[PDB]
Amino acid sequence: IAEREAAASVPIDIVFGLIHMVLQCGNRRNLYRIIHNISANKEVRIFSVETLVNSIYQAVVEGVIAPEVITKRGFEALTYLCTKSSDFTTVFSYNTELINKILQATNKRTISESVKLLSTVGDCFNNDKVAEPENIEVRKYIGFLEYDMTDDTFKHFCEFIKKTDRFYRPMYLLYLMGGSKKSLEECLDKKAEFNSHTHHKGIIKLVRMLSLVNIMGITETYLDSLMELREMPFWEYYFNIILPKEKESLYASSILPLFKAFVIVHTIQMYIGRNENINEFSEIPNSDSSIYYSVVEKEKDLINTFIQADPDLLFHAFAGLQKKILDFDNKRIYFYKKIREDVQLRPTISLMVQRGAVFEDTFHQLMRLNGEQVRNAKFNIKFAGEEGVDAGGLTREWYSELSKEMFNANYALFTPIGSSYQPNHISHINPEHLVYFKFIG
Amino acid sequence: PGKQISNTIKQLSNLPEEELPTYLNNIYEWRCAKTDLLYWVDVLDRFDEILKAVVTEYGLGQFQNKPMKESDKEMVYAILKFQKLLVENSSNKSMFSSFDVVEPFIYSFELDLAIEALYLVSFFASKIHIQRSIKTSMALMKMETLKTLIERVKEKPQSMYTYYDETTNNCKRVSIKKAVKKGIYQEIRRFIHAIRLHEMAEQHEKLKIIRMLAFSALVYYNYTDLPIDSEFISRDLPETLAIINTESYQMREAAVTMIDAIFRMRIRHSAVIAAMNAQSHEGMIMNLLKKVVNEDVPEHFAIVFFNFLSSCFASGPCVSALFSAGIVQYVCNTLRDQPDISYRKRMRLVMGANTFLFTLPAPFTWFISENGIRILSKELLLAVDVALGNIKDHDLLMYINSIMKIISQLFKNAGTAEAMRGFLEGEFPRAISLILFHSEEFTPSILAYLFSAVGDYIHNEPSNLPFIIEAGIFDGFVMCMKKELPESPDFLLELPNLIEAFFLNSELIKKIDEENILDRIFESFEIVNLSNIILMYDIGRAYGIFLENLVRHYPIISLTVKEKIYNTMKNLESMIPNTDPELMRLLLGNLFRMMHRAVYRKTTNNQLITDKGLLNNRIISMLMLIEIPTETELYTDVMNILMEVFDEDQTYVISYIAKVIDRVMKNKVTLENIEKIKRILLIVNYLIFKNEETCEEFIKHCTSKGFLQIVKRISQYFDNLKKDTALVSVAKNESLTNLYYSFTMGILKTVYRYSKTNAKEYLKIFGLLVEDLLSKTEQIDHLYYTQRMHGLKNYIMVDKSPQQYPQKNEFVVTQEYLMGINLSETLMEHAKNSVSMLKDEKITMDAHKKVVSSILEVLSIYVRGIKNLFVPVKEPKKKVCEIEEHVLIIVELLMDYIDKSSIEHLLNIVKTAFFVTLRKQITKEMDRENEGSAEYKRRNILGSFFISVFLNLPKEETEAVLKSDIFTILVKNKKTFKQVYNKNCFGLLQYAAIKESRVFSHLVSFIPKMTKQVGASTDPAFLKLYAVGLVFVAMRDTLKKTTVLSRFIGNIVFAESTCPAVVEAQGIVILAIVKLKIEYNLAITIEDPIIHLNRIYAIVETAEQKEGLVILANLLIRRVIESKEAAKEAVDTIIKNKHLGKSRMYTVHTVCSNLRNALFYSISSFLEYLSSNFECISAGWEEIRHKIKIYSGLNAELFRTLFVHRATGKMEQIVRIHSLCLLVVSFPQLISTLVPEDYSFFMYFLENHAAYSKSLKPSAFQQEDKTLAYWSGHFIMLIFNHTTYVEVKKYILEKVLELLPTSINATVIFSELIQEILTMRFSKNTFDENTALVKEMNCLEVMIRSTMQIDNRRKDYGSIMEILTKPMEYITRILAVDEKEAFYEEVTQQSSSEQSEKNEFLKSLCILPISKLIGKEMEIFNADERMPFVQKILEGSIISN
């Protein structure tokens, strides 16, 4: 992960034939290690990577060994280098023209691994080490969005966009507005005879690149085009004509992406800049002539049904929705999920109580620690007297006995109304018993 | 097996293979019990081999025979069908070996073959999750290959098919529509599948279910390696269930099978249940049931459907959903609304009930609420009264059986016991009473279920028992009992349960005693037919337990029960003798199996049925009539019960057996009688040996006149048995004498071991026995005379003093008794009788010799315990001296009749004679006083006789006792010393000198006289004795004498010898002389031993046991090269190992023993080390306070001479190079001294090492050549690693890089050499220097150049390259990492008998460090001795120093 320097033990002449042979051979994992090790010093690293990339360039645009197999082998080798030690990606930042060459050399089969390669390359933007960000020639790469990709390729594209946002927000958004415009126009034109499965690629690309727009944010100048785009009556036409027919005709599995897209198109936000190291300030924009609220009120039942189908949508696409639409069941499941990712680090401690008074001993051994530790503590209960049930049963019975004891007659910390309880009066509650309420909390 | 089963087996085996399918086709269904596959091994093997023959006739590879015989397909179709039929109701399916030929049937063009084979495979793989043992047969074929059939079957989906071929790295369409020739149209099976999909589609339904069955098989193998996702569950499962709904029976059967496969998976289970949609009242499976009941269905199809249904109810959530649908109401209405439904259909209904009623409790509660029990009662009444008054119907009877089982298991569970409220309210009593009053026409299982239900209901609430009682039910039970019981296991198993349920009412006990039904249970035990069943299950244990429960809870009629059981015992006793032995063996085994429980229980009231007298007489008569094997558990439990019987009353039992044996003695003399006595003493020996504690009264009975008289009569009878050889064989006589002796010694051991026995009480028995035996000894019958005297020898064995103190051999009480008998005179009488009969030439010298040895042992152990023997004390030699004189007379008499069989006893006599001396009971003073004693002269003349005997023994006999402690005293007389020295038994003298110093002092005078005979003595013992005598005398004279060695002068030369012992002895002599000369001034001149060294190297090429030779060669060369200061420093370094231990180390003995190597190597070094750097030795007086090698005097010239020897043969070159390795390891600085020119000769090592490649293993190899090359390379590796020189390494690396590119093998081997040059690191700084050099030399360039210049497109070239990667990968990684961490980098970041002996020995040879090498080199002179005299005198020196 750091630059390594040693004596130049290898002559620059032999590595040419060596890279030739590794390209002209198989079972090269060992050879991969050989090249990675010999490229330790800076000079050999630079010469080897430039030689390999020039060879790959000549393999495709310029063309025994077939050009395609040699190209895939060289791409695999480049990935194997760039992945480890993170310093062979730095040579791309050192040159910035070899990047232009490699991006230029990109056929249909290239993207399947070129996406991974470029995602790895994007590390040169993580440290912002470019020093020449004006001549990267990205519009070809952003235009290759029109090709056919997969899920992992999309993830690599997303992380590359996350790396390159602070550098090319203007031009990336400039292309994305037109791309989204043409995608929605295509969906609008074919909506009379649209298919959610035959053109499922269309809905995939639309929702994906709109999500990429969200991750990209919006600028001030493009706001005219953005407000134009948020006023497409394709939404109304679908939800009022095609949604009624596709509910009773087609499978909702391919129809759900359209609902995600409808959420996203109004989920568009406003990023001002990556002022801090790891984040960009986000501000919520507004819609003036939209009857989008009317639409979401119209099919609120379907919205809640689809949210119940998969709560994970709230963390990926459905995050822009208002919780008011959601019922308390889905909201509570989402709340449990949200509170359980920040589980933090959990230390394990023991707990000992007596059947005579669990509450008193629990209070005594729980006031000593802090809120964070007791929050993260794994209560391994040890009931005195009885040892016949597992730790989970011990904790369950400890909780039940605590619940019994806070409402016990002797404690009287809360007075009963029946099933429920309310805290006892200030006159009846002794001043020393107020800490018991903190313990209850 | 079976009866019709055996007929089917033999018919399948023998019938012609043309008529095999026709006969097979008659087998339509399995209306019989399950079996084991072992009975069809012949049929399975025959079918497998005929299938193999057929498929080889077809080809199995390409299915060339497209026009195929219809007889063949019918044959294999029937084979697979009835194979499925057999295995679907079989056991031990893991042995099915016919699986090996089924995949060609799976991929066959014939679709009947494919459906049959895939159905069989699916059934076999169904039980993978349960049995798990059939996978071995399944593993014969690859499961992943069936993924070809995963693609769904469509109406000619694609006419193009893509195949994958390597190297070319392309996949393109193949021609399918051609089909011009049936030959050309792992990928072959996939292509055939594509052809079957495309070309023919008329019969696509069968292959449409072939794909389905293959999918099912891949489900069964592993559901993880399956395409199960949302799409499969959402499409194929609905398609399969639609097939079940609509399509025809034939392929909806396969759909049902695949549905079973799916739902047994238990994945996506909620989704599967919600999708399959039986939750509706018009759900699927009950809809199919409505069809089946309404529209007629094929019988086999109906059976498959109902088995699928039973599979459905088995799952928890499935039956929960089915019950929620309302199946209970459906079945209730179906039963209570129409009776015209077929009987078998109602049967299938009631199996469905038997499943779902017990699967879950909620349907049970609903059914109880729905009051379907009353409907069940009504239909049961209808079924029975249709059966009653009418002829027997098979289906009707088994349906009544189904009703009985459903009601019985419904009543069985207490959680299902809620139905026992409305029992009497219904008409159940009327129906069950009708059944009981007419049980003669019903299946026994019906009766068993009925009785179980009746008993369970009665036990549920015995309050209602009278209501049953006046219902006349028990009367019907009586009528049923009038009929004799059938061959039913479970009915007989459960009958005691109903009988006990009757005992719940006391009046029923009264009536059953009145009517005496228990006669049936009593008489059940003598039935051979039922004996098989009793063997099969645990009937005896159940009946026993029921008996104790009855007697304990209801002992009212216990007297009648006792009477009946004893009558049955006598009955079963009666017919034993006139019956086949095996039948009675097994029947008695079962009978005593249930006796084991029946009586002698710890529970109360069981003692009421434990009669010692009658049962004892019966069991004794039984044992006295039949022979019983020991290993059977029948033997075990009969032993147990007889032990309780005897423990209750020992006296009466022993009296009874005594009178029995006397009475049978009075009978006629017969062989079977002899066997009876044999077994009665067998049992008495058993009971005596097992007995731990004994009452004195039992011993009194043993010494009672009856016991002694019966024992003496037994002895008399045994003697009479020797009278006639014809009636009783001589071997039988020997065996009976042996067993009688064993019995007598056992009982004598018991009585003697018995505490505080009356002395005279023991004496009368023992003296009577011994006098009888000795009287019988001198009779005509001398055949058993040896056996009789061995018997008295064992008598001497047993009457032994406790000797509880360790190392104690003395009589405690028996000594006075023994010489109160005057044994010695009898012994001399028998001795002179033996001498005379020897003179009378009626004895073989061998038999006479063995008699002498036996009597010698007798005397030896007789005198072993006698006190103060040969002890000069005034009072006790009144008789002991007389016995000593007798012993001397006896041993003198038998002088010339001693051989190997007597030496041990005679030496034991010596050891007894000299106990005080050898066990040092003296203070070394009174022994030196008491020489003027008669005992001393007697023991001295005894030893004289002994030495005379020994010197009359050849080498073989002498080697047996070559190391005994007494020889330290025997040869103490210098007269005997010169006598034995002139007798040439010098090894004894060596051991004596090792252990005693006076004989060594005599040898000191002896040495100069024998110094001249050293040369060409050809006696290994003589020469080793010389060498060892010199080493001890030199190191002893170093202790304050220093002068003795100076007086010795001479010169010795050696002649050629072919015996290896001679040459190695000469080498050892050279070792001693040079090792003494280098330190001490010796006047014996010796030439340069190199001549002897090359003699050794020549002879090892031929001789065996090379270890001593090679080790002596290595130690001698190191000794010659090494010097005094080096030896002293090495000894100090070695001692530092135990010096740093700071342990207790209180005794000097441990110090010496663990450092004997330092003791022998140089006493001066060890002495000065202990005087200066004294150890943590307590020394017997408190404790003492405690607290890069450069060597000089070496001889590199000999190393230089040796280095260029260049021998010819294999083994001597190996020896030379091994010596080179040891010296360079020991003294690397010698290499720094070599001539700058000589390094040219390393080409020899490099080339002869390049002869073999261990990695690339070739055939026609030689293991000795392999180890030669390995050692050659080891030399170079040691040069690079353990040495710190630079320039020589530079030269040799230059040479190796020059020689590397010569050829592929040279490149590979030198690359390896560089690799493990770098890997094994002796030191970090040395390794850093090595890395600096190897980087400095640019070797990577030339090695990689030779690497890619030679790269050829070859098959094993890949293996060569992957081998080559490791060295260059390692070195390149080293050259990248910094120098500090590079050191820590690591990898991956009787010709045959002697041949094997030498193969193992070569690997046994290893690199020996200094420590164990020195230890073993001084081991030769130490001869594994634990303490020599030099050690003692040196320890005294250390103490006084």
mmCIF file of C-alpha atoms in Angstrom, chain B residues 902-979:
data_model
loop_
_atom_site.group_PDB
_atom_site.id
_atom_site.type_symbol
_atom_site.label_atom_id
_atom_site.label_comp_id
_atom_site.label_asym_id
_atom_site.label_seq_id
_atom_site.Cartn_x
_atom_site.Cartn_y
_atom_site.Cartn_z
ATOM 1 C CA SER B 902 20.244 -77.524 33.035
ATOM 2 C CA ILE B 903 22.591 -74.526 33.014
ATOM 3 C CA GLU B 904 19.929 -72.068 34.181
ATOM 4 C CA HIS B 905 18.860 -74.173 37.177
ATOM 5 C CA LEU B 906 22.457 -74.918 38.111
ATOM 6 C CA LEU B 907 23.347 -71.209 37.972
ATOM 7 C CA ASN B 908 20.316 -70.473 40.149
ATOM 8 C CA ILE B 909 21.792 -72.957 42.617
ATOM 9 C CA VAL B 910 25.016 -70.931 42.514
ATOM 10 C CA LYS B 911 23.121 -67.685 43.072
ATOM 11 C CA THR B 912 21.425 -69.206 46.110
ATOM 12 C CA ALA B 913 24.772 -70.505 47.375
ATOM 13 C CA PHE B 914 26.485 -67.093 47.273
ATOM 14 C CA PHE B 915 23.581 -64.809 48.221
ATOM 15 C CA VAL B 916 25.399 -62.813 50.904
ATOM 16 C CA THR B 917 28.404 -62.156 48.667
ATOM 17 C CA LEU B 918 26.449 -61.193 45.551
ATOM 18 C CA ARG B 919 23.938 -59.199 47.619
ATOM 19 C CA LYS B 920 26.824 -57.686 49.654
ATOM 20 C CA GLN B 921 25.278 -58.500 53.035
ATOM 21 C CA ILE B 922 28.890 -58.526 54.307
ATOM 22 C CA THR B 923 30.918 -55.475 55.314
ATOM 23 C CA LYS B 924 33.869 -56.820 53.242
ATOM 24 C CA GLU B 925 35.470 -57.941 56.539
ATOM 25 C CA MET B 926 33.745 -60.990 58.045
ATOM 26 C CA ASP B 927 33.887 -62.661 54.632
ATOM 27 C CA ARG B 928 37.643 -62.036 54.651
ATOM 28 C CA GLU B 929 37.636 -63.613 58.125
ATOM 29 C CA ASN B 930 35.532 -66.719 57.511
ATOM 30 C CA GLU B 931 37.596 -68.413 54.777
ATOM 31 C CA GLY B 932 38.516 -71.073 57.337
ATOM 32 C CA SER B 933 35.035 -72.595 57.184
ATOM 33 C CA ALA B 934 33.668 -75.838 55.781
ATOM 34 C CA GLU B 935 30.937 -73.924 53.948
ATOM 35 C CA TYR B 936 33.641 -71.968 52.121
ATOM 36 C CA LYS B 937 35.410 -75.120 50.944
ATOM 37 C CA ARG B 938 32.087 -76.676 49.914
ATOM 38 C CA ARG B 939 31.063 -73.669 47.832
ATOM 39 C CA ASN B 940 34.579 -73.500 46.366
ATOM 40 C CA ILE B 941 34.529 -77.127 45.232
ATOM 41 C CA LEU B 942 31.020 -76.508 43.889
ATOM 42 C CA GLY B 943 32.369 -73.631 41.811
ATOM 43 C CA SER B 944 35.232 -75.847 40.668
ATOM 44 C CA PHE B 945 32.715 -78.393 39.375
ATOM 45 C CA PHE B 946 30.848 -75.515 37.753
ATOM 46 C CA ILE B 947 33.869 -74.121 35.905
ATOM 47 C CA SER B 948 34.783 -77.640 34.810
ATOM 48 C CA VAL B 949 31.278 -77.936 33.345
ATOM 49 C CA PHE B 950 31.458 -74.545 31.616
ATOM 50 C CA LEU B 951 34.820 -75.185 29.975
ATOM 51 C CA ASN B 952 33.284 -78.381 28.545
ATOM 52 C CA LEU B 953 30.745 -76.244 26.661
ATOM 53 C CA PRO B 954 31.198 -75.039 23.063
ATOM 54 C CA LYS B 955 30.871 -71.383 22.085
ATOM 55 C CA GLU B 956 27.108 -71.556 21.498
ATOM 56 C CA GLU B 957 26.374 -72.642 25.071
ATOM 57 C CA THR B 958 28.911 -70.215 26.563
ATOM 58 C CA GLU B 959 27.325 -67.242 24.779
ATOM 59 C CA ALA B 960 24.040 -67.898 26.609
ATOM 60 C CA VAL B 961 25.285 -66.792 30.043
ATOM 61 C CA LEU B 962 28.295 -64.818 28.815
ATOM 62 C CA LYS B 963 27.336 -61.966 31.185
ATOM 63 C CA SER B 964 26.482 -63.132 34.709
ATOM 64 C CA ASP B 965 27.427 -61.427 37.956
ATOM 65 C CA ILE B 966 28.825 -64.546 39.641
ATOM 66 C CA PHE B 967 31.731 -64.782 37.181
ATOM 67 C CA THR B 968 33.185 -61.759 38.986
ATOM 68 C CA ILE B 969 33.732 -64.177 41.881
ATOM 69 C CA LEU B 970 34.185 -67.563 40.173
ATOM 70 C CA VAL B 971 37.368 -66.651 38.292
ATOM 71 C CA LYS B 972 38.715 -64.701 41.267
ATOM 72 C CA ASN B 973 41.351 -67.409 41.734
ATOM 73 C CA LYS B 974 44.241 -66.635 39.394
ATOM 74 C CA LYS B 975 44.653 -70.377 38.852
ATOM 75 C CA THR B 976 41.141 -70.443 37.409
ATOM 76 C CA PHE B 977 42.090 -67.222 35.615
ATOM 77 C CA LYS B 978 44.929 -68.837 33.678
ATOM 78 C CA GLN B 979 42.823 -71.982 33.248
#
